Amino acid sequence: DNSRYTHFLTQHYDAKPQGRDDRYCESIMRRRGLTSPCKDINTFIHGNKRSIKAICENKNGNPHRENLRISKSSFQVTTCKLHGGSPWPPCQYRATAGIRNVVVACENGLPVHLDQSIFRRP
């Protein structure tokens, strides 16, 4: 079904953010249900949803590493990194904005998984 794709959009897609700063992270992580308890790191992709889906096809993607796909285009992204040493709220975040290639895993031609590890640096 469409459920794993919808999960991916919920955790990793925000088309038109205002801010892209710490307060943006603190709010969107809460809106998307990632603060009970606090997720340690999470990246949102901005812009055109259909360009993200195209990573699963030759239009905007290539094979990457072990059965993943990397985008041909680059995307505006915001990575939210949890501050401090507790998994429990309050969930305070620091934002890192970037323009990056995105790595996904696809199922049935839809992105379902972000390779979140690549956004740990910088």
Numbering used by the authors: 2 to 123
What does the published report state?
Angiogenin (ANG), a 14-kDa basic protein is an angiogenic ribonuclease and member of the bovine pancreatic ribonuclease (RNase A) family (also known as RNase 5). Like RNase A, ANG cleaves preferentially on the 3′ side of pyrimidines and follows a transphosphorylation/hydrolysis mechanism. In addition, the crystal structure of human ANG has revealed that it has an RNase A fold and the catalytic triad (residues H13, K40 and H114) is conserved. The enzymatic activity of ANG is several orders of magnitude lower than that of RNase A towards conventional RNase substrates, but essential for its angiogenic effect.
In the native ANG structure F100 and V103 residues (located on β5 and β6 strands respectively) are in close proximity to the substrate binding site involving residue E108. The results from two variant structures F100I and V103I are analyzed here and both the variant residues are well defined in their respective electron density maps. The F100I variant implicated in ALS has retained only 39% of the enzymatic activity due to the significant loss of main chain interactions with S75 even though several of the side chain interactions have been retained with S75. The introduction of an Ile residue seems to have slightly increased flexibility in the vicinity of the mutated residue.
